[PDB]
Amino acid sequence: IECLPGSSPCTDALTCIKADLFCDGEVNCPDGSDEDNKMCATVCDGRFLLTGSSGSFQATHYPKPSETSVVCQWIIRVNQGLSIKLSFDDFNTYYTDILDIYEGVGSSKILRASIWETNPGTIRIFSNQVTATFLIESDESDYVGFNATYTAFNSSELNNYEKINCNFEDGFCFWVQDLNDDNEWERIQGSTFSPFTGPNFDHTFGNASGFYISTPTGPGGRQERVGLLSLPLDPTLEPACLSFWYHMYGENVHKLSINISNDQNMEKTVFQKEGNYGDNWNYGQVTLNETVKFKVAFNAFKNKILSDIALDDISLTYGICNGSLYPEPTLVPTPPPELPTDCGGPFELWEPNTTFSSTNFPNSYPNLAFCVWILNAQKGKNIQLHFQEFDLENINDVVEIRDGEEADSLLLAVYTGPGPVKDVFSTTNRMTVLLITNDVLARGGFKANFTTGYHLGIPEPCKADHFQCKNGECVPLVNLCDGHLHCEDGSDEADCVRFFNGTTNNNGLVRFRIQSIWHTACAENWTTQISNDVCQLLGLGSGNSSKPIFPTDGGPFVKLNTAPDGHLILTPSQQCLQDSLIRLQCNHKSCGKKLAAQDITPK
Amino acid sequence: IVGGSNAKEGAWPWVVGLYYGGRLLCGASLVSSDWLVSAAACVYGRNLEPSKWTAILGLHMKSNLTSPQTVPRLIDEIVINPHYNRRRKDNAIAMMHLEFKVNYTDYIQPICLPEENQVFPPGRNCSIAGWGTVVYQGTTANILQEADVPLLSNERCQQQMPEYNITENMICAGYEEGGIDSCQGDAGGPLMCQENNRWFLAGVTSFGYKCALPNRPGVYARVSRFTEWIQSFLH
Amino acid sequence: APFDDDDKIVGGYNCEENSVPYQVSLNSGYHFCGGSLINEQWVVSAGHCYKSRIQVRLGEHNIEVLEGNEQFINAAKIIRHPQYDRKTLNNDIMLIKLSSRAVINARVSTISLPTAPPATGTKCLISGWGNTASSGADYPDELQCLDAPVLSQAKCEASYPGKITSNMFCVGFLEGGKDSCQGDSGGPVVCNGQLQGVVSWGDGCAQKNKPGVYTKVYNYVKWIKNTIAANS
Ligand SMILES: *[C@@H]1O[C@H](CO)[C@@H](O[C@@H]2O[C@H](CO)[C@@H](O[C@@H]3O[C@H](CO)[C@@H](O)[C@H](O[C@H]4O[C@H](CO)[C@@H](O)[C@H](O)[C@@H]4O)[C@@H]3O)[C@H](O)[C@H]2NC(C)=O)[C@H](O)[C@H]1NC(C)=O
Numbered sequence A: 001i002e003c004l005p006g007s008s009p010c011t012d013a014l015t016c017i018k019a020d021l022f023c024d025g026e027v028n029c030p031d032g033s034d035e036d037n038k039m040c041a042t043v044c045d046g047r048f049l050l051t052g053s054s055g056s057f058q059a060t061h062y063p064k065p066s067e068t069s070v071v072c073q074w075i076i077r078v079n080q081g082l083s084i085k086l087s088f089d090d091f092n093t094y095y096t097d098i099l100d101i102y103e104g105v106g107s108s109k110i111l112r113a114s115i116w117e118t119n120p121g122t123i124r125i126f127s128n129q130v131t132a133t134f135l136i137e138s139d140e141s142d143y144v145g146f147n148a149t150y151t152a153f154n155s156s157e158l159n160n161y162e163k164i165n166c167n168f169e170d171g172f173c174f175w176v177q178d179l180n181d182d183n184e185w186e187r188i189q190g191s192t193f194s195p196f197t198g199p200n201f202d203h204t205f206g207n208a209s210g211f212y213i214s215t216p217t218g219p220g221g222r223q224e225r226v227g228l229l230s231l232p233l234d235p236t237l238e239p240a241c242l243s244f245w246y247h248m249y250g251e252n253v254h255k256l257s258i259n260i261s262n263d264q265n266m267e268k269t270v271f272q273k274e275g276n277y278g279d280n281w282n283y284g285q286v287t288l289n290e291t292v293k294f295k296v297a298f299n300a301f302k303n304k305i306l307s308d309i310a311l312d313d314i315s316l317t318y319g320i321c322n323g324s325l326y327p328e329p330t331l332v333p334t335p336p337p338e339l340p341t342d343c344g345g346p347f348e349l350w351e352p353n354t355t356f357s358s359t360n361f362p363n364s365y366p367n368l369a370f371c372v373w374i375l376n377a378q379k380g381k382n383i384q385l386h387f388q389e390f391d392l393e394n395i396n397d398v399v400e401i402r403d404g405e406e407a408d409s410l411l412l413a414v415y416t417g418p419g420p421v422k423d424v425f426s427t428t429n430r431m432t433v434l435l436i437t438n439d440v441l442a443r444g445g446f447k448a449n450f451t452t453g454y455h456l457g458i459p460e461p462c463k464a465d466h467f468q469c470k471n472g473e474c475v476p477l478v479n480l481c482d483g484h485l486h487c488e489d490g491s492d493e494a495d496c497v498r499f500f501n502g503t504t505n506n507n508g509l510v511r512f513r514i515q516s517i518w519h520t521a522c523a524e525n526w527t528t529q530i531s532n533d534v535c536q537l538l539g540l541g542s543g544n545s546s547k548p549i550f551p552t553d554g555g556p557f558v559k560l561n562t563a564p565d566g567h568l569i570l571t572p573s574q575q576c577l578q579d580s581l582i583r584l585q586c587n588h589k590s591c592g593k594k595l596a597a598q599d600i601t602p603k
Numbered sequence B: 001i002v003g004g005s006n007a008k009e010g011a012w013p014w015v016v017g018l019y020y021g022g023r024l025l026c027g028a029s030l031v032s033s034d035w036l037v038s039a040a041a042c043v044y045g046r047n048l049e050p051s052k053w054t055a056i057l058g059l060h061m062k063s064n065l066t067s068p069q070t071v072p073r074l075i076d077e078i079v080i081n082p083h084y085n086r087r088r089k090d091n092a093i094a095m096m097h098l099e100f101k102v103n104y105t106d107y108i109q110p111i112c113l114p115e116e117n118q119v120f121p122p123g124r125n126c127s128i129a130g131w132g133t134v135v136y137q138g139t140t141a142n143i144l145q146e147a148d149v150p151l152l153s154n155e156r157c158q159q160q161m162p163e164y165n166i167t168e169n170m171i172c173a174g175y176e177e178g179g180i181d182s183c184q185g186d187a188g189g190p191l192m193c194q195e196n197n198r199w200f201l202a203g204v205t206s207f208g209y210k211c212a213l214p215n216r217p218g219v220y221a222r223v224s225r226f227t228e229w230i231q232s233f234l235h
Numbered sequence C: 001a002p003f004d005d006d007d008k009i010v011g012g013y014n015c016e017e018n019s020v021p022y023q024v025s026l027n028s029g030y031h032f033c034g035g036s037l038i039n040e041q042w043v044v045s046a047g048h049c050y051k052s053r054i055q056v057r058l059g060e061h062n063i064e065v066l067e068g069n070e071q072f073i074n075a076a077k078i079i080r081h082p083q084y085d086r087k088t089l090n091n092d093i094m095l096i097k098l099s100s101r102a103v104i105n106a107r108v109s110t111i112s113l114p115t116a117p118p119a120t121g122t123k124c125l126i127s128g129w130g131n132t133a134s135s136g137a138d139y140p141d142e143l144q145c146l147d148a149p150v151l152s153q154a155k156c157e158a159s160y161p162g163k164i165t166s167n168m169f170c171v172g173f174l175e176g177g178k179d180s181c182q183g184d185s186g187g188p189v190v191c192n193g194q195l196q197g198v199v200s201w202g203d204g205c206a207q208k209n210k211p212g213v214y215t216k217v218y219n220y221v222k223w224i225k226n227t228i229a230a231n232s
């Protein structure tokens, strides 16, 4: 008989069953050989089923450290209605080793416990079947082996004292982890991950040598619900008091509650605390009711990372609860958002006040600050900011400088980031300094100078009626629309050709300026080269020829001379008669005409 | 952002991308051989160091910057419109000067500016461009998207979004039922309208309230009134 | 609904860390820790990130959205530092070996090991899947990258007295109540184009003072070379 992949035949080779079914506790083979100890040769101890009341087992490589990955499984069977308690003295391994205790046998198992590199302590399973799965996930020399001592006990004759009281040293005691939770509680010795979140020591023992339970300490990023359940409590003729210690430290602590549930479906909450209560163990006191059978639970809601909640020292007594000597816990003070809004600070200053820190420049500037500085100077005087020191964040913090005296302010310069910045010159006698701050990474700030004067940024005009460019270079006659690069600004090479009285934007008459005087032009002969030159001078696209209308003007016309290099030569010599006005016609440059064959999507 | 579609090669030669620090932060349009027009809001606070801005002309795909049709260029001069406020989000148009120049080609072409007293009538469908997202936030698309959306009159725009001044310096485009928008996610290009037989720089991508939401008009920066300011720097 | 960040502003964060092939993530059903791709079969991650089953994601662009540009290789063996003090999180570094060799492409590539110790004021980059929301108790799926220079030893020690050791150095600067580098539990620390550290812990989610404490990887030259050589 051949079996499909993922399935294995039985000893009799008559029926094919799933591979996981073998050595799992569920009898599926017709002959029942799937649960045979010899067939399930784990090599760990040569035994697979432990039907005795008590016993122990060993792992692979008893005399020498293990060197090969071996999978071992053990199943312990006892009388129906009895529970098995697993006790461990000291367990260590090379990280990758999990005992994998499960509830029951077969496919009904989900999870019971998983402890690695640490001593599990004591684990109690409230079922007649206990299963373990020894696994090795490393090729290095792992621990020598694993052993477990167990003893059978009725587990139903237990009184309320044993069921409730647990200082978290002998494992979780008789508490049963809920199977309807996103994650299970973790018992970790000493401090855990997420610094400034979770206990650094055990309450019962007093130092890191103790053991306590808490929410999972993995760096997760999802909200989870954890829960712990207890055995039903027998009825009592006297009211009882429930005492426990809870440590809720962390900025993301959501809620901790008990939510007592009874067999009458009248569930109610007797304890509920929310928020951070500091790194101190608080005392919880609960009175009891519901004589009928009921279960005590601890439902804790786990938020994202840094939301650890811990419980320790659960105990039970009788009678009305005494006065709580420990004071009622209070929430952390929390950094108060005292309405940052807009600090404002100084608004306007005059010439006597020049040096000033931004807000607290020696130390820092407040977050969410919109500071307005009104720099007012005397009439006719410009303002030079002349930054002294400047240390902003980068792209978020920005210092905005504008020009005042009008509703429509004109932006002058924007400064940001570390390092020195250039000076700012204002057009009129008013400058506005705006500081926009963010809520994070507030640097020291900036310091100003408040320098005022006449023509602070205006260079001295040239003498002898000489034209001056933006850069301040003297241009008497050399670069008056002559086509040079004397000044990098290009103001000296401004367009000296323009339209006059035209029909549309790209139409007009002849108007050419040599140095400072606009005048008409002579175009008795017209070709394509002169039209292209006119188009280039006007900054338009390809053009064509044009014709005059009537000689209505007899003024000082200037002839046009063309060159093979494309340069236009202006000769101020009217050696012609009957001059006529010439219309200048050109077309615009080629713009973004669509060329791709775009499809049509009627959606 | 919802509403995007496939873009053919060379369909929008005047749409260029701006990279700051190695990431596509904003978009711009090619107007002349050495100048670009982009939003002033997205370039605010980064004009002190123009060398960190990378101008990609002719870009078609986010992760396919290897075709010869795309000629990368640097930015040396950055100018912001003095009328910008950053509080009312008014006049969010800034110009960036190219390193040396760019040669005109099939996949890199300039776009005509609106003329004087030229206003596109409201309700006329116009195209939008940008490297936006499919969802409202996240999942940036690697392919340039295009969509058609009619212009919305400012009289209804100021009422549909009672949170700003709008005034006459903004052009709003959107749908009553929504679905098509480009305000958020990434600008990646201006608002383009075509009349006669040629496109124009009708608007520049601006702020907005929500993407693909009914009664949420998309604000675009008006360029008809800013033609003189751009032409002052074009030549 | 209005938001603090709008008007085609990405907040200064990279578009899913473009041209960042050294970013890897550890998955056990959800994102819990990050790391760096040392070579085709080795990654570096914090020691506290040890889990029974960890799935290594290579060149991940989104935690929940898959676009076919991600590589999923299951971990084969995890090696942790043999001197780990969980109380102080000292020597918080470990190595995880991928079962199958990685495929080097534009989104997955190796990063050279550091050769010299970092100096104060060195320009460094921090990568991780941190929060980028101004307000609201929500976890965004965006990929966050921030720049922060290494500070002086005295200031770093004084920031968290009794916790800073010779193997720890501070990358974050100043303070701030908004989002920062914060944790991510093993975010890459690449300074001057070379990896220099691994995120270990910090003062909460950048509540105050330094956003986090980073474990130096330059000191463990032997543990990063001989271990890889002997565990090939
Ligand atoms: C202990 O744990 C149990 C189980 O987890 C828990 O029971 C759940 O309680 C919630 C709320 O207490 C219930 O949700 C309610 O569902 C009803 C019907 O769908 C809604 O009408 C409720 O809305 C209103 O509820 C209150 C009025 O009762 C209002 O004050 C409130 O503002 C809402 O407007 C609410 O959504 C849920 O159905 C049960 N689940 C069950 C019964 O299975 C219990 O609350 C926990 N605490 C105890 C017992 O103290």
Ligand SMILES: *[C@@H]1O[C@H](CO)[C@@H](O[C@@H]2O[C@H](CO)[C@@H](O[C@@H]3O[C@H](CO[C@H]4O[C@H](CO)[C@@H](O)[C@H](O)[C@@H]4O)[C@@H](O)[C@H](O)[C@@H]3O)[C@H](O)[C@H]2NC(C)=O)[C@H](O)[C@H]1NC(C)=O
Residues within 6 Å of the ligand: A238, A239, A240, A288, A289, A290, A291
């Ligand atoms: C349950 O929690 C209670 C806390 O509220 C604990 O105290 C009392 O519990 C009872 C029942 O649970 C509550 O209900 C009332 O009980 C009284 C008792 O009446 C007594 O007195 C009258 C008059 O002398 C007498 O005729 C009766 O026989 C009783 O001797 C009833 O009369 C009411 O109708 C009502 O049912 C009480 O309100 C509550 N408080 C007090 C002050 O009694 C209770 O101990 C818890 N149960 C436990 C621990 O088993």
Ligand SMILES: *[C@@H]1O[C@H](CO)[C@@H](O[C@@H]2O[C@H](CO)[C@@H](O[C@@H]3O[C@H](CO[C@H]4O[C@H](CO)[C@@H](O)[C@H](O)[C@@H]4O)[C@@H](O)[C@H](O)[C@@H]3O)[C@H](O)[C@H]2NC(C)=O)[C@H](O)[C@H]1NC(C)=O
Residues within 6 Å of the ligand: A346, A347, A348, A349, A350, A352, A353
């Ligand atoms: C810029 O520098 C200025 C230096 O001249 C700073 O001026 C200072 O202003 C404070 C507060 O006003 C003065 O402190 C007091 O000022 C009052 C002013 O009295 C006013 O009312 C009387 C009523 O009769 C009127 O006669 C006056 O003219 C005032 O209008 C005085 O009465 C007090 O005695 C006291 O001096 C400072 O004296 C004054 N000078 C200095 C050197 O501090 C100004 O504050 C600076 N700007 C900012 C924003 O701080």
Ligand SMILES: *[C@@H]1O[C@H](CO)[C@@H](O[C@@H]2O[C@H](CO)[C@@H](O[C@@H]3O[C@H](CO)[C@@H](O)[C@H](O)[C@@H]3O)[C@H](O)[C@H]2NC(C)=O)[C@H](O)[C@H]1NC(C)=O
Residues within 6 Å of the ligand: A080, A081, A082, A154, A155, A156, A157, A158
């Ligand atoms: C484990 O211990 C529990 C005790 O909690 C045992 O349960 C108890 O078993 C006895 C039988 O010896 C039950 O007594 C019988 O109860 C029925 C009513 O159900 C009554 O009609 C009979 O006359 C007799 O009294 C008892 O009720 C039951 N429960 C308790 C709380 O005592 C359980 O049998 C033990 N399991 C073992 C020893 O395997």
Ligand SMILES: *[C@@H]1O[C@H](CO)[C@@H](O[C@@H]2O[C@H](CO)[C@@H](O[C@@H]3O[C@H](CO)[C@@H](O)[C@H](O)[C@@H]3O)[C@H](O)[C@H]2NC(C)=O)[C@H](O)[C@H]1NC(C)=O
Residues within 6 Å of the ligand: A241, A317, A318, A319, A320, A321, A322
């Ligand atoms: C509440 O506090 C008391 C006192 O610490 C706890 O136990 C009490 O212990 C005394 C001593 O054995 C018990 O006897 C009482 O002694 C006093 C003084 O000799 C006497 O005046 C009384 O008449 C009584 O005989 C007492 O019953 C016992 N309980 C109380 C309530 O006093 C008690 O455990 C603490 N917790 C609770 C929930 O009561």
Ligand SMILES: *[C@@H]1O[C@H](CO)[C@@H](O[C@@H]2O[C@H](CO)[C@@H](O[C@@H]3O[C@H](CO)[C@@H](O)[C@H](O)[C@@H]3O)[C@H](O)[C@H]2NC(C)=O)[C@H](O)[C@H]1NC(C)=O
Residues within 6 Å of the ligand: A386, A388, A449, A451
């Ligand atoms: C901006 O503020 C700084 C200080 O906050 C000003 O620096 C100071 O400028 C004055 C001249 O206005 C300097 O006085 C002169 O110094 C030279 C040497 O550099 C000396 O030869 C002269 O006899 C005279 O004493 C002063 O030393 C200087 N101080 C510092 C610390 O640099 C700066 O002038 C302001 N910018 C302006 C007003 O535009």
Ligand SMILES: *[C@@H]1O[C@H](CO)[C@@H](O[C@@H]2O[C@H](CO)[C@@H](O[C@@H]3O[C@H](CO)[C@@H](O)[C@H](O)[C@@H]3O)[C@H](O)[C@H]2NC(C)=O)[C@H](O)[C@H]1NC(C)=O
Residues within 6 Å of the ligand: A543, A544, A545, A585, A586, A587
């Ligand atoms: C020559 O320069 C003048 C300056 O504007 C223009 O000449 C005339 O321009 C009008 C445009 O309103 C032309 O009317 C139409 O032109 C189109 C081609 O653009 C043509 O397809 C139509 O059938 C209609 O004619 C007119 O023809 C044109 N006349 C001449 C003699 O050119 C025009 O810009 C330049 N002409 C050319 C052919 O480029």
Ligand SMILES: *[C@@H]1O[C@H](CO)[C@@H](O[C@@H]2O[C@H](CO)[C@@H](O[C@@H]3O[C@H](CO)[C@@H](O)[C@H](O)[C@@H]3O)[C@H](O)[C@H]2NC(C)=O)[C@H](O)[C@H]1NC(C)=O
Residues within 6 Å of the ligand: B103
């Ligand atoms: C972008 O446009 C400019 C301007 O047209 C191009 O520059 C021009 O390129 C041509 C062809 O490479 C040059 O012609 C050749 O120049 C060499 C000297 O380099 C000469 O030995 C040959 O006999 C021939 O004349 C031309 O000189 C050059 N400059 C100008 C002012 O035309 C540029 O090549 C274009 N770039 C691209 C990528 O298309």
Ligand SMILES: *[C@@H]1O[C@H](CO)[C@@H](O[C@@H]2O[C@H](CO)[C@@H](O[C@@H]3O[C@H](CO)[C@@H](O)[C@H](O)[C@@H]3O)[C@H](O)[C@H]2NC(C)=O)[C@H](O)[C@H]1NC(C)=O
Residues within 6 Å of the ligand: A603, B125, B148, B149, B150
């Ligand atoms: C401007 O763009 C809008 C869309 O944003 C255009 O409206 C569209 O007009 C067409 C009609 O040509 C509608 O198509 C219709 O579809 C129904 C579906 O059953 C069909 O029965 C009709 O016979 C017709 O084909 C289309 O639905 C409609 N778009 C929307 C969103 O409703 C408008 O025509 C454009 N105007 C210009 C001048 O381009």
Ligand SMILES: *[C@@H]1O[C@H](CO)[C@@H](O[C@@H]2O[C@H](CO[C@@H]3O[C@H](CO)[C@@H](O)[C@H](O)[C@@H]3O)[C@@H](O)[C@H](O)[C@H]2NC(C)=O)[C@H](O)[C@H]1NC(C)=O
Residues within 6 Å of the ligand: A204, A205, A206, A207, A208, A209, A210
């Ligand atoms: C850390 O916590 C542990 C928890 O057990 C503390 O242990 C306490 O130890 C004292 C010691 O008393 C004697 O010690 C002898 C060994 O020197 C030993 O042979 C003898 O039997 C007896 O135990 C013990 O009295 C306490 O009971 C222990 N604590 C508990 C909670 O049982 C330890 O002192 C703590 N501090 C340190 C530094 O380890």
Ligand SMILES: *[C@@H]1O[C@H](CO)[C@@H](O[C@@H]2O[C@H](CO)[C@@H](O)[C@H](O)[C@H]2NC(C)=O)[C@H](O)[C@H]1NC(C)=O
Residues within 6 Å of the ligand: B158, B164, B165, B166, B167
């Ligand atoms: C844009 O802002 C201006 C600010 O001046 C608003 O002007 C207001 O006009 C009304 C009508 O007369 C006056 O009563 C107000 O006093 C003006 N405001 C101020 C601050 O003086 C204008 O209404 C705004 N536009 C919109 C669409 O809200």
Ligand SMILES: *[C@@H]1O[C@H](CO)[C@@H](O[C@@H]2O[C@H](CO)[C@@H](O)[C@H](O)[C@H]2NC(C)=O)[C@H](O)[C@H]1NC(C)=O
Residues within 6 Å of the ligand: B196, B197, B198
């Ligand atoms: C303005 O629109 C017309 C639409 O017809 C454009 O196309 C002209 O179409 C006629 C068809 O009769 C052709 O004969 C012409 O050659 C086309 N071009 C021109 C210039 O006449 C026209 O192109 C548009 N204007 C522009 C910018 O070219």
Ligand SMILES: *[C@@H]1O[C@H](CO)[C@@H](O)[C@H](O)[C@H]1NC(C)=O
Residues within 6 Å of the ligand: A087, A088, A089, A090, A091, A145, A146, A147, A148, A149
């Ligand atoms: C497992 O083996 C170790 C070493 O012998 C031992 O201390 C421990 O007791 C054994 N297991 C149990 C159940 O304690």
Ligand SMILES: *[C@@H]1O[C@H](CO)[C@@H](O)[C@H](O)[C@H]1NC(C)=O
Residues within 6 Å of the ligand: A500, A501, A508, A509, A510, A511, A520, A552, A553, A581
């Ligand atoms: C404008 O019209 C007048 C009317 O005579 C004419 O004389 C003048 O030449 C025209 N324009 C130009 C460019 O000269």
Ligand SMILES: *[C@@H]1O[C@H](CO)[C@@H](O)[C@H](O)[C@H]1NC(C)=O
Residues within 6 Å of the ligand: A522, A524, A525, A559, A560, A561, A562
């Ligand atoms: C057209 O007239 C101008 C006027 O001086 C002259 O310089 C030019 O040579 C003429 N063009 C010819 C003759 O082709």
Ligand SMILES: *[C@@H]1O[C@H](CO)[C@@H](O)[C@H](O)[C@H]1NC(C)=O
Residues within 6 Å of the ligand: B009, B060, B061, B064, B066, B067
């Ligand atoms: C993408 O790049 C490749 C490079 O080989 C090129 O062949 C292809 O045409 C490009 N596609 C687009 C749409 O640019």
